[PDB]
Design a protein around this motif. Structure first.
Motif, PDB file in Angstrom:
ATOM      1  N   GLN G 425       0.825  -1.201   0.000  1.00 55.97           N
ATOM      2  CA  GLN G 425       0.000   0.000   0.000  1.00 55.97           C
ATOM      3  C   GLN G 425       0.862   1.254   0.000  1.00 55.97           C
ATOM      4  O   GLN G 425       0.562   2.224  -0.707  1.00 55.97           O
ATOM      5  N   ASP G 426       1.941   1.252   0.784  1.00 59.67           N
ATOM      6  CA  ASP G 426       2.822   2.411   0.839  1.00 59.67           C
ATOM      7  C   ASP G 426       3.480   2.673  -0.508  1.00 59.67           C
ATOM      8  O   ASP G 426       3.576   3.826  -0.946  1.00 59.67           O
ATOM      9  N   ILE G 427       3.941   1.618  -1.182  1.00 62.71           N
ATOM     10  CA  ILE G 427       4.572   1.796  -2.484  1.00 62.71           C
ATOM     11  C   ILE G 427       3.617   2.483  -3.441  1.00 62.71           C
ATOM     12  O   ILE G 427       4.039   3.265  -4.302  1.00 62.71           O
ATOM     13  N   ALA G 428       2.324   2.201  -3.317  1.00 60.85           N
ATOM     14  CA  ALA G 428       1.335   2.896  -4.128  1.00 60.85           C
ATOM     15  C   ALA G 428       1.204   4.348  -3.691  1.00 60.85           C
ATOM     16  O   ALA G 428       1.395   5.271  -4.488  1.00 60.85           O
ATOM     17  N   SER G 429       0.901   4.571  -2.411  1.00 61.09           N
ATOM     18  CA  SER G 429       0.655   5.929  -1.941  1.00 61.09           C
ATOM     19  C   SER G 429       1.826   6.854  -2.244  1.00 61.09           C
ATOM     20  O   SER G 429       1.626   8.050  -2.477  1.00 61.09           O
ATOM     21  N   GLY G 430       3.046   6.322  -2.251  1.00 57.30           N
ATOM     22  CA  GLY G 430       4.240   7.111  -2.472  1.00 57.30           C
ATOM     23  C   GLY G 430       5.093   7.307  -1.241  1.00 57.30           C
ATOM     24  O   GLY G 430       6.161   7.922  -1.340  1.00 57.30           O
ATOM     25  N   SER G 431       4.660   6.806  -0.085  1.00 59.59           N
ATOM     26  CA  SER G 431       5.438   6.979   1.136  1.00 59.59           C
ATOM     27  C   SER G 431       6.789   6.285   1.034  1.00 59.59           C
ATOM     28  O   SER G 431       7.824   6.859   1.393  1.00 59.59           O
ATOM     29  N   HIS G 432       6.800   5.052   0.546  1.00 59.02           N
ATOM     30  CA  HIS G 432       8.027   4.273   0.556  1.00 59.02           C
ATOM     31  C   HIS G 432       9.042   4.873  -0.413  1.00 59.02           C
ATOM     32  O   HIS G 432       8.669   5.346  -1.491  1.00 59.02           O
ATOM     33  N   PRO G 433      10.331   4.872  -0.063  1.00 64.71           N
ATOM     34  CA  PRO G 433      11.335   5.399  -0.998  1.00 64.71           C
ATOM     35  C   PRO G 433      11.389   4.654  -2.320  1.00 64.71           C
ATOM     36  O   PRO G 433      11.716   5.260  -3.348  1.00 64.71           O
ATOM     37  N   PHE G 434      11.079   3.357  -2.331  1.00 63.74           N
ATOM     38  CA  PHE G 434      11.134   2.590  -3.567  1.00 63.74           C
ATOM     39  C   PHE G 434      10.079   3.027  -4.571  1.00 63.74           C
ATOM     40  O   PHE G 434      10.146   2.616  -5.733  1.00 63.74           O
ATOM     41  N   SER G 435       9.111   3.842  -4.155  1.00 62.96           N
ATOM     42  CA  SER G 435       8.077   4.285  -5.079  1.00 62.96           C
ATOM     43  C   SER G 435       8.668   5.121  -6.202  1.00 62.96           C
ATOM     44  O   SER G 435       8.259   4.996  -7.361  1.00 62.96           O
ATOM     45  N   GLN G 436       9.630   5.984  -5.877  1.00 64.38           N
ATOM     46  CA  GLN G 436      10.250   6.813  -6.904  1.00 64.38           C
ATOM     47  C   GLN G 436      10.992   5.960  -7.922  1.00 64.38           C
ATOM     48  O   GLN G 436      11.009   6.278  -9.116  1.00 64.38           O
ATOM     49  N   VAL G 437      11.611   4.872  -7.467  1.00 65.14           N
ATOM     50  CA  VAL G 437      12.375   4.017  -8.369  1.00 65.14           C
ATOM     51  C   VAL G 437      11.473   3.481  -9.471  1.00 65.14           C
ATOM     52  O   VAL G 437      11.793   3.571 -10.661  1.00 65.14           O
ATOM     53  N   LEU G 438      10.329   2.914  -9.087  1.00 60.76           N
ATOM     54  CA  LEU G 438       9.385   2.419 -10.079  1.00 60.76           C
ATOM     55  C   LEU G 438       8.896   3.539 -10.982  1.00 60.76           C
ATOM     56  O   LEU G 438       8.632   3.312 -12.167  1.00 60.76           O
ATOM     57  N   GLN G 439       8.773   4.750 -10.441  1.00 59.03           N
ATOM     58  CA  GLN G 439       8.289   5.876 -11.229  1.00 59.03           C
ATOM     59  C   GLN G 439       9.363   6.398 -12.175  1.00 59.03           C
ATOM     60  O   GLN G 439       9.054   6.819 -13.295  1.00 59.03           O
ATOM     61  N   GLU G 440      10.623   6.380 -11.742  1.00 58.69           N
ATOM     62  CA  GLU G 440      11.729   6.797 -12.593  1.00 58.69           C
ATOM     63  C   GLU G 440      12.161   5.717 -13.569  1.00 58.69           C
ATOM     64  O   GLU G 440      12.923   6.011 -14.497  1.00 58.69           O
ATOM     65  N   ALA G 441      11.698   4.485 -13.389  1.00 60.65           N
ATOM     66  CA  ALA G 441      12.140   3.379 -14.223  1.00 60.65           C
ATOM     67  C   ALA G 441      11.381   3.377 -15.541  1.00 60.65           C
ATOM     68  O   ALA G 441      10.148   3.420 -15.560  1.00 60.65           O
ATOM     69  N   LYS G 442      12.127   3.330 -16.642  1.00 59.45           N
ATOM     70  CA  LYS G 442      11.507   3.338 -17.961  1.00 59.45           C
ATOM     71  C   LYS G 442      10.723   2.060 -18.211  1.00 59.45           C
ATOM     72  O   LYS G 442       9.640   2.094 -18.806  1.00 59.45           O
ATOM     73  N   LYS G 443      11.253   0.924 -17.771  1.00 60.04           N
ATOM     74  CA  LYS G 443      10.649  -0.384 -18.007  1.00 60.04           C
ATOM     75  C   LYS G 443      10.658  -1.180 -16.714  1.00 60.04           C
ATOM     76  O   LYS G 443      11.415  -2.146 -16.564  1.00 60.04           O
ATOM     77  N   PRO G 444       9.826  -0.800 -15.754  1.00 55.63           N
ATOM     78  CA  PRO G 444       9.726  -1.567 -14.516  1.00 55.63           C
ATOM     79  C   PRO G 444       8.936  -2.849 -14.716  1.00 55.63           C
ATOM     80  O   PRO G 444       8.156  -2.998 -15.657  1.00 55.63           O
ATOM     81  N   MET G 445       9.167  -3.787 -13.806  1.00 54.52           N
ATOM     82  CA  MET G 445       8.573  -5.111 -13.884  1.00 54.52           C
ATOM     83  C   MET G 445       8.204  -5.561 -12.483  1.00 54.52           C
ATOM     84  O   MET G 445       9.051  -5.570 -11.588  1.00 54.52           O
ATOM     85  N   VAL G 446       6.939  -5.923 -12.297  1.00 59.45           N
ATOM     86  CA  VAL G 446       6.419  -6.360 -11.009  1.00 59.45           C
ATOM     87  C   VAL G 446       5.977  -7.805 -11.155  1.00 59.45           C
ATOM     88  O   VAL G 446       5.223  -8.138 -12.076  1.00 59.45           O
ATOM     89  N   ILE G 447       6.450  -8.660 -10.254  1.00 60.40           N
ATOM     90  CA  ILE G 447       6.236 -10.097 -10.342  1.00 60.40           C
ATOM     91  C   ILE G 447       5.656 -10.579  -9.023  1.00 60.40           C
ATOM     92  O   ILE G 447       6.259 -10.375  -7.964  1.00 60.40           O
ATOM     93  N   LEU G 448       4.498 -11.219  -9.092  1.00 60.45           N
ATOM     94  CA  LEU G 448       3.850 -11.825  -7.941  1.00 60.45           C
ATOM     95  C   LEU G 448       3.841 -13.334  -8.121  1.00 60.45           C
ATOM     96  O   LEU G 448       3.451 -13.835  -9.179  1.00 60.45           O
TER      97      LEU G 448
END
Ligand code: SF4
Ligand code: SF4
Ligand code: SF4
Ligand code: SF4
Ligand code: FES
Ligand SMILES: [K+]
Ligand SMILES: [Zn+2]
Lengths: 115, 129, 87, 209, 48, 96, 699, 106
Positions: G425-448
């Motif tokens: 939830q934090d990664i979505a809201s933007g609280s977590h520092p890793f949120s910027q990484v996914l936002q700055e990443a040209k080709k991010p990949m999320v795997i569940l």
């Protein structure tokens, strides 16, 4: 590209003439074959078998293939007429020893893995 | 040109009836047209230069007497060689076999640098030679 | 019974003929799913396939409707035919 | 020629046979498609199948040839080729102490013209080709099986014919005759894969596709 | 052999045997390999 | 050595024996099951280990060209005896 | 453009700058001799067998390492080149042991073959030979290291592919020995692949030791089902028996590697097999019977019961042909309770959209990614070949990897965000520092991982992870077609079953308990006899007796993946077909034929008698299950998220613990592997060491 | 001489046999040795060419001196490992002496 050297027939109509002529020769020859080879089949049975072989290939429509089948048939006639064949060769058309093989899914399923 | 006096045949080529093959070993057999995979245990690539045709595997059973491997499939060890997929497909079609074609898997070109083993800021630096 | 049990929609991703089916999925599919929650509507894309609508009724009976060169409205009516009328 | 283990080369024959190939091609342009001479000095003439009688008659009767003996006539099955059957004529000239190979092609359905008019030896050789490969020679005195059993269906020497065939024979006491049945082998033939993955002869490397 | 006698090994037969075909001592071929596929033995208890 | 099964059949050096319910043991009725009594696994174990004074020893099996291809065996591990991959003979390094 | 021009024996070839002499010779069809170079390993230049003469140059150059220079003419068949090869081969064979008859590498050895083609026919070495100690590195790899030619391929593979730096060189000179120095086991999910790369018999397979020879084996190209990667393989069969499993190269999946389970679990197919149909007698014990009787007993109940009283559960190693066949049979009794053992959230669009349950980025896409977020999964053990692809990008493309789960060893350093699901939830809201990484990443990949979805809060995790993907993908930073959300499956049958219409999980079978249950390869124990109406008539169809068979009232033996031509769909969605190598053992039969026969006995005859007719039915239910080796893109991700948001479930407080944490859990996950005795030796080894598992190795 | 079998299951005899008369299966022995579990020669497939004794690298398989082994049944001519080992132990004295005479020509 489709232009191809013929064997004998130039069209299926000319080839089907040779098929019928060949059937005539076979039909005359079964009565002598049963007598000469001393077979235990009837003339009707042999003439039925000739009909079956001619029916198997009843789908072809290529003049060249029909010519080859006629050529191969005529060779078998020279063998049988001249008694180059033997009783074992003539009776191989009838597959007497081969017990009937199953031809339904369940029967094939019970016996083995084949289609 | 060729003066034999030629005929036109617009039918497709089918030679099944004049090959002497029993019906069961035409209708029910599935051909496989492929380029053999390289044996991963060796690095040579000379056995991947030509197309092959194989047929489906069927039952092998143990001989009661000696335990040998017995078969009733006449096309068990039949393997044909072709220069191209088109040639193989043509041969199968004229012989009335059903076939499945699998496309050639070619090794992809790669970037090879001996210098990268000694990179200043990258993870490609090797710890041992 | 004899009611509907499943709906399957087949189409291509990049073909011209299936454009109508893509429009329904993009807009009206979400509305449909909420209207019919427990019915399984399966959209299965695959390259160079004539678009079709498959419906499975009870006891295995199935019907197909070709959606080739159909406008989105036609697709909606065809689905309404299946959902409304049942075999 | 002082290398103990290497076959000596004879260039005099290579020059002689090469010239005679040019001689044939010039005289019979209508049919000759290719002429090649090998490293071990053998000349091969490759012709259109419609020049079998013209080419063979010329070689037999021309005074600068006189290939009076047909040593062998055979066939080779190459399935990948659209004309899978290669017909090979090997001829001997006693006058000039020379041999020449003539090659032509055909397919399953296209007939070749019988060479019996040129060499009476070809009668049986052509029968063998028909029996073993299924190639039809037109205008043959008597074309019939020569090596296979009576009633044998199939052409064994084609590369698509199984080695052990489709049927096998035994004696059945019930019918008191020898009968044919589908082939079942107590021990299946074991196919050994012997080819090495590493190339052996660079000079024959085929151009990349 | 009375002059140049054969070399002695323990495993060599001491008593020669003439051809034993047609007798109770004849050789009968058999496979020397053990079974390949073991088969599941069902439980010996009555479930339920 | 040849050990006999509960049925009485002799077991081979490959461990082959026909279980009680196998019909194929009828081939031995009135005849015999031929089994070699000299089990090579037992006879090689009888051969004494050879004490040698080097880290490496060669074995040709005896007879020279009448033996097996010559190989060299490392004897630097004192928890085991070097064994030949052809003849099964064992060697040990003798403490200097 | 930037291509330069070089000549190989005088023939022009245009090569990109940075290309090696070696790689240039390939483009004209010439393979330079090699012992140390491997296209998927780092260059070493130590064997010196690639040496090749450059015209107008006095020194031979190592082709494997020397870049081409414009204008170079490469003389591959010159006297200098040929004499260099003969000299090198002579040094290689000087201390090599005379072990070819006793060496399993005979017939498939590059030293043998390259000696014949590029070496002399005799020796001038009149001295003694080197001998080396043997080193135990586990129960899967046999070491006869006197045969080692010091090519360092094993050292490089372990470091650069497996991520394990346990193999190295000790000493120097002729006494230099590859090994671990200490007594250690090279145990890893990719350990066996050092056997293939080793060009000699120094490293060989212990299970396969002495059993066969290369020339006498028939090669069958099939697929691996131990996992969902769908690794392409070769099955070597001799005389109707399976002898070994080898990798078959597929660039976009397994490259040329396979996992140890894939390689060494084939021996469980020869144990605990179901060979004859079985039924319960009066005493209540399973007894052998015939197909006629067993199918009749099963069909009688199928006719009697109808609707929800009939159910089925599909296991992990089930083929698409059987899955659709069973579906049709139960549909014709008006039963839709077709279930799997692997849970996938049914909320929102569930299985309606493929994109909701596929690894949309593809295995090969990881190479083009910039950031990878792993949620609730140990890709090292759930998908060994997929993790190896991640580490490749980690190494060559400097990929960044983050994990929301228990801290595991993935063989590459990663950023551990945490273990609680609430971080999503934090990664979505933007609280977590890793949120910027996914936002700055040209080709991010999320795997569940599908392992995390088995939790009772699975539907919440999927929507949260989906929500993250929507935000960054919707933001213009992500490209036109990059697909960010991915599901990584661990089961081979799941994707096909989901595509075909099966309900994921056994929830529907506990809501409406059935009086008749078909267990089609279901050995996971999801549903037992304490969860069913007493007097349930259970039918188990499969190849092994593990958990489902002993509780069943009827057993119908089925084929395994080595014994049938069947369709399996990988985590990507790519469909691949196995091929028959051996046939089903005893009275066993093909799975889809058992159902088809049962239908005829019951009156509900299905409309297919051949494999090519049941595959046409697969096309009707999903056209993609017949397009073999093609990945079909799935879209409409936005439509799926909109539906997911509606329900709003609540994440639990339980931390995400992957089912497999150590190597010991890797080796036994399915019926075939549990039967295997080799995977049992591996488990014993990684729990106690080689203290007891060590075995004699003489040849 | 120890009594250990010379054969190491290399399968070169099986590969060279022009008649495919030899069948071999091998497994690791309880002591780790590379030894055969099956070694079968079909003497009604053999052509008695001696290629299998040329190919053998350890002088394990030999065509011996005996020619008087005619049988009353076909099955008696399908030789297994035990039969071939008994023949070796039966004929070893003659076999070894003949090899001693000809091994210098080989
Ligand atoms: S690795 Fe084995 S097969 Fe290859 S040369 Fe060495 S001993 Fe012979
Ligand atoms: S063990 Fe094999 S792979 Fe490793 S260095 Fe030696 S030869 Fe190369
Ligand atoms: S002697 Fe007999 S067994 Fe030996 S190789 Fe020749 S044919 Fe085969
Ligand atoms: S008899 Fe000789 S050649 Fe045959 S497997 Fe045994 S050692 Fe090898
Ligand atoms: S391949 Fe170049 S030195 Fe080994
Ligand atoms: K190796
Ligand atoms: Zn020795």
């Amino acid at each position: 590209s489709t232009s191809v050297k013929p064997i004998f027939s130039r069209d299926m109509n000319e080839a089907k003439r040779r098929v019928r002529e060949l059937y005539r020769a076979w039909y005359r020859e079964v009565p002598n074959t049963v007598h000469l080879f001393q077979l235990d089949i009837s003339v009707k049975q042999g003439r039925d078998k000739v009909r079956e072989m001619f029916k198997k290939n009843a789908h072809i429509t290529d003049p060249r293939v029909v010519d080859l089948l006629v050529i191969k048939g005529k060779m078998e006639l020279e063998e049988t007429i001249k008694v180059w064949k033997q009783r074992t060769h003539v009776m191989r058309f009838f597959h007497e020893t081969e017990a009937p093989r199953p031809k339904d899914f369940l029967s094939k399923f019970y016996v083995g893995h084949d289609p | 040109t060729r003066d034999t006096q030629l005929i036109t045949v617009d039918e497709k080529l089918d030679i099944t009836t004049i090959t002497g093959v029993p019906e069961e070993h035409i209708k029910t057999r599935k051909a496989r047209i492929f380029v053999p995979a390289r044996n991963n245990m060796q690095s040579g690539v000379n056995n991947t230069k030509k197309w092959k045709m194989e047929f489906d595997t069927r039952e092998r059973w143990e001989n009661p007497l000696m335990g040998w491997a017995s078969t009733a499939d006449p096309l068990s060890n039949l393997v044909l060689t072709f220069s191209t997929k088109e040639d193989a497909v043509a041969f199968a079609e004229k012989n009335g076999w059903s076939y499945d074609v699998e496309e050639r898997k070619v090794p992809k070109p790669k970037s090879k640098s001996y210098g990268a083993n000694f990179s200043w800021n990258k993870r490609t630096r090797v710890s041992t030679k | 019974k004899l009611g509907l049990r499943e709906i399957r929609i087949h189409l291509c991703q990049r073909s011209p003929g299936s454009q109508g089916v893509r429009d329904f999925i993009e807009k009206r599919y979400v509305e449909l799913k909420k209207a019919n929650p427990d019915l399984p509507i399966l959209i299965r894309e695959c390259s160079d396939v004539q678009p079709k609508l498959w419906a499975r009724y009870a006891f295995g009976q199935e019907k197909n409707v070709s959606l080739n060169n159909f406008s989105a409205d036609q697709v909606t009516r065809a689905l309404e035919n299946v959902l409304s009328s049942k075999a | 020629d002082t290398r103990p283990t290497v076959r000596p080369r004879n260039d005099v024959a290579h020059k002689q046979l090469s010239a005679f190939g040019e001689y044939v091609a010039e005289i019979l342009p209508k049919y000759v498609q290719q002429v090649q001479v090998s490293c071990f000095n053998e000349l091969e003439i490759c012709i259109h199948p419609d020049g079998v009688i013209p080419v063979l008659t010329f070689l037999r009767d021309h005074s600068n040839a006189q290939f009076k003996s047909l040593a062998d006539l055979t066939a080779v099955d190459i399935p990948t080729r659209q004309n899978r059957f290669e017909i090979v004529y090997n001829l001997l000239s006693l006058r000039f102490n020379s041999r020449i190979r003539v090659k032509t092609y055909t397919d399953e359905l296209t007939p070749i013209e019988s060479s019996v008019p040129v060499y009476k030896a070809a009668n049986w050789y052509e029968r063998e080709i028909w029996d073993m490969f299924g190639v039809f020679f037109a205008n043959h005195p008597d074309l019939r099986r020569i090596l296979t059993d009576y009633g044998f269906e199939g052409h064994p020497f084609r590369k698509d014919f199984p080695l052990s065939g489709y049927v096998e024979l035994r004696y059945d006491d019930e019918v008191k005759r020898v009968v044919a049945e589908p082939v079942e082998l107590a021990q299946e033939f074991r196919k050994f894969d012997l080819n090495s993955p590493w190339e052996a002869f660079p000079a024959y490397r085929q151009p990349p596709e | 052999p009375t002059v140049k006698p054969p070399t002695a090994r323990k495993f060599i037969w001491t008593n020669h045997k003439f051809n034993l075909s047609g007798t109770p001592q004849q050789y009968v071929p058999y496979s020397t390999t053990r079974k390949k596929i073991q088969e599941w033995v069902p439980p010996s208890t009555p479930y339920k | 050595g040849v050990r006999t099964s509960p049925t009485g059949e002799k077991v081979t050096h490959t461990g082959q024996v026909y279980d009680d319910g196998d019909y194929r043991k009828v081939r031995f009725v009135g005849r015999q099951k031929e089994v070699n009594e000299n089990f090579a696994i037992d006879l090689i174990a009888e051969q004494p280990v050879s004490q040698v004074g080097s880290r490496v020893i060669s074995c040709d099996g005896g007879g020279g060209a009448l033996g097996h291809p010559r190989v060299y065996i490392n004897l630097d591990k004192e928890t085991k005896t070097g064994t030949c991959g052809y003849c099964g003979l064992q060697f040990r390094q003798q403490h200097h | 453009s930037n291509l330069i021009e070089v000549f190989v024996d005088g023939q022009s070839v245009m090569v990109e700058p940075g290309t090696t002499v070696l790689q240039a010779c390939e483009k004209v069809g010439m393979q330079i001799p090699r012992f140390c170079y491997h296209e998927r390993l780092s260059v070493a230049g130590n064997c010196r067998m690639c040496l090749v003469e450059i015209e107008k140059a006095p020194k031979v150059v190592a082709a494997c390492a020397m870049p081409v220079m414009k204008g170079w003419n490469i003389l591959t068949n010159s006297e200098k080149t040929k004499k260099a090869r003969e000299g090198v081969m002579e040094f290689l064979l000087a201390n090599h042991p005379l072990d070819c008859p006793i060496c399993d590498q005979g017939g498939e050895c590059d030293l043998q073959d390259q000696s014949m083609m590029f070496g002399s026919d005799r020796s001038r070495f009149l001295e003694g030979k080197r001998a080396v100690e043997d080193k135990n590195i586990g129960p899967l790899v046999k070491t006869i290291m006197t045969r080692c030619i010091q090519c360092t391929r094993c050292i490089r593979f372990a470091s650069e592919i497996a991520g394990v730096d346990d193999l190295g060189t000790t000493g120097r000179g002729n006494d230099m020995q590859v090994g671990t120095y200490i007594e250690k086991m090279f145990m890893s999910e990719l350990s066996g692949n050092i056997i293939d790369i080793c060009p000699v018999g120094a490293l060989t397979s212990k299970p396969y030791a002495f059993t066969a020879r290369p020339w006498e084996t028939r090669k069958t190209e099939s697929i691996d089902v131990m996992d969902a990667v769908g690794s392409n393989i070769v099955v070597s069969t001799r005389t109707g028996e399976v002898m070994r499993i080898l990798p078959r190269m597929h660039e976009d999946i397994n490259e040329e590697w396979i996992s140890d389970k894939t390689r060494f679990a084939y021996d469980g197919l020869k144990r605990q097999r179901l060979t004859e149909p079985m039924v319960r007698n009066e005493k209540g014990l399973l007894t052998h019977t015939t197909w006629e009787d067993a199918l009749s007993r099963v069909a009688g109940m199928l006719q009697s019961f109808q609707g929800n009283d009939v159910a089925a559960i599909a296991g992990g190693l089930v083929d698409a042909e059987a899955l659709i066949a069973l579906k049709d049979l139960l549909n014709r009794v008006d039963s839709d309770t077709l279930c799997t053992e692997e849970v996938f959230p049914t909320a929102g669009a569930g299985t309606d959209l493929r994109s909701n349950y596929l690894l949309n980025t593809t295995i090969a896409g990881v190479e083009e990614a910039d950031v990878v977020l792993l949620v609730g999964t140990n890709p090292r053990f759930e998908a060994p070949l997929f993790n190896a692809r991640i580490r490749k990008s980690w190494l060559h493309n400097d990929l960044k990897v983050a994990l929301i789960g228990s801290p595991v060893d993935l063989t590459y350093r990663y950023d551990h965000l945490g273990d609680s699901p609430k971080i999503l939830q934090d990664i979505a809201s933007g609280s977590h520092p890793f949120s910027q990484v996914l936002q700055e990443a040209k080709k991010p990949m999320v795997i569940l991982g599908s392992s995390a979805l088995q939790r009772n809060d699975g539907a919440a995790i999927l929507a949260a992870v989906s929500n993250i993907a929507q935000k960054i993908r919707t933001s213009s930073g992500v490209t036109g077609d990059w697909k960010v959300m991915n599901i990584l499956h661990r089961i081979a049958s799941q994707v096909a079953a989901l595509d075909l219409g099966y309900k994921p999980g056994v929830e529907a079978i506990q809501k409406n308990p059935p009086k008749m249950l078909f267990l089609l390869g279901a050995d996971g124990g999801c549903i037992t006899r304490q969860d069913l109406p007493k007097d349930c008539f259970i039918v188990y169809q499969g190849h092994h007796g593990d958990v489902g068979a002993p509780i069943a009232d009827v057993i119908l033996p089925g084929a395994a993946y080595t014994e049938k031509s069947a369709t399996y769909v990988n985590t990507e969605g790519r469909a691949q077909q196995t091929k028959v190598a051996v046939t089903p053992p005893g009275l066993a039969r093909e799975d889809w034929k058992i159902i088809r026969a049962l239908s005829e006995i019951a009156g509900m005859t299905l409309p297919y008698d051949t494999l090519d007719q049941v595959r046409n039915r697969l096309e009707e239910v999903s056209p993609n299950l017949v397009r073999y080796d093609d990945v079909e893109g799935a879209n409409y991700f936005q439509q799926a998220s909109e539906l997911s948001k509606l329900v709003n479930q609540q994440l639990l407080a339980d931390p995400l613990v992957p089912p497999q944490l150590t190597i010991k859990d890797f080796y036994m996950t399915d019926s075939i592997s549990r039967a295997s005795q080799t995977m049992a030796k591996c488990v014993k080894a990684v729990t106690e060491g080689a203290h007891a598992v060590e075995e004699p190795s003489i040849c | 001489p120890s009594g250990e079998e010379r054969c190491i299951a290399c399968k070169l005899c099986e590969a060279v046999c022009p008649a495919q008369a030899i069948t071999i299966e091998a497994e690791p022995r309880a002591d780790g040795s590379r030894r055969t579990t099956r070694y079968d020669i079909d003497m009604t497939k053999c052509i008695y060419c001696g290629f299998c004794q040329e190919a053998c690298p350890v002088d394990a398989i030999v065509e011996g001196p005996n020619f008087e082994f005619s049988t009353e049944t076909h099955e008696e001519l399908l030789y297994n490992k035990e039969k071939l080992l008994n023949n070796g132990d039966k004929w070893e004295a003659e076999i070894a002496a003949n090899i001693q005479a000809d091994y210098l020509y080989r």
